[PDB]
Amino acid sequence: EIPVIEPLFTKMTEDIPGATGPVFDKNGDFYVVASPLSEALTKANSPAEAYKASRGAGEILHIDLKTGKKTVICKPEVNGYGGSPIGCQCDRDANQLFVADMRLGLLVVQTEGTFEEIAKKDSEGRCMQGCAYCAFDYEGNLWITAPAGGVAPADFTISLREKFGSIYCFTTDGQMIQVDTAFQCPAGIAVRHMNDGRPYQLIVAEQPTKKLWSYDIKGPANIENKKVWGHIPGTHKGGAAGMVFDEDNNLLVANWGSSHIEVFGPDGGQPKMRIRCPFEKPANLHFKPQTKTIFVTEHDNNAVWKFEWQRNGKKQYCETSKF
User: Fold this and answer.
1) Quick one: which of 149, 153, 210, 229 has the fewest CB in 10 Å?
2) Reading across the β-sheet that carries 282-287, which strands appear in turn?
């Protein structure tokens, strides 16, 4: 039996469809992503059906943590095609967000709301797929999951039932390298680092398959030894979505549809503990820097909550020093 804890959750905000991409920038400002397409995929009989019902482009919102006021930072669209941002990370050398988008690929978003679409195509020259989750390594290379088909203007599709989801690395030389493919809905992603700051394991959630995969990282866009690393419990619709490390390199994983966040030790395997949530659909999570406080987004109430974890979070790339 896996032991379960039931900490206190405090609701921070609501009325955010498909709430995801919780992120803190270098100033300690907190952002979340609204995703009409996420919410639609939850209710549809198909990706197409979901795409059709989706009210519009998603948005990056600033949330004031004292007042709860939501401010639209960016509503990305390119050429009439609405973006579907999901996952975010803050850069280290500039206060700007790198945003995985299921319709537009990888974005760089400024706090004043301008943005750049980073890649129409990958380095081999093939079209880009829609991106969902991303994680910086401490070198500045961005690892990205891509569960969707081609970016707009291709029809929207997602690898929820077929194997076509891919993994990329966007390197510090600005190359978008496809590093793996034929996933069934690759979702959350994380980089385990060595004591010395060196990147060395890539953890990737494959959502409906209730699996976490690992690879050994040997350099920028250079991975091998692909293995199943962790088991996600339950037979519910869903599976692992976002994930984050704590300071001890335990991996916390939102298990969408299970009402739990799963906690894996450094060697993976089975969860060592589960965290019971007051909602069925935790989607994504992020630590408040230099704190034990975890912010969690959820799709029962399209809300953001916080709870206290047993230790501080692992530093993100944005919190580390250039030298």
Assistant:
1) 153
2) 10-13, 303-308, 293-298, 282-287
8-state DSSP, 37: H
Residues 309 and 41: beta-carbon distance below 8 Å: no
Instruction: Give the resolution value in Å.
Output: 1.8
Solving technique for this entry?
X-ray
Dihedral of CA atoms 97, 101, 107, 112 in degrees, nearest 10, equals -50
SS3 of 36, please? helix
Residue positions annotated with a catalytic role:
299
Domain containing 69 — which CATH number?
2.120.10.30
59, 85, 275, 311 from 5: Cα distances, Å: 33, 32, 5, 14
Q: Which residues contact 12 (CB under 8 A, 6 or more apart)?
A: 63, 65, 68, 295, 303, 304, 305, 306
Is residue 60 within 8 A of residue 93, CB to CB? The reply is no
Domain count, the chain: 1
Tokens of 181: 């493919």
DSSP designation for 52: H
Yes or no: say if 85 and 75 are a contact pair by the CB < 8 Å rule.
Answer: no
Task: Give, in order, the Cα–Cα distances in Å from 226 to each of 67, 197, 223.
Answer: 45, 22, 8
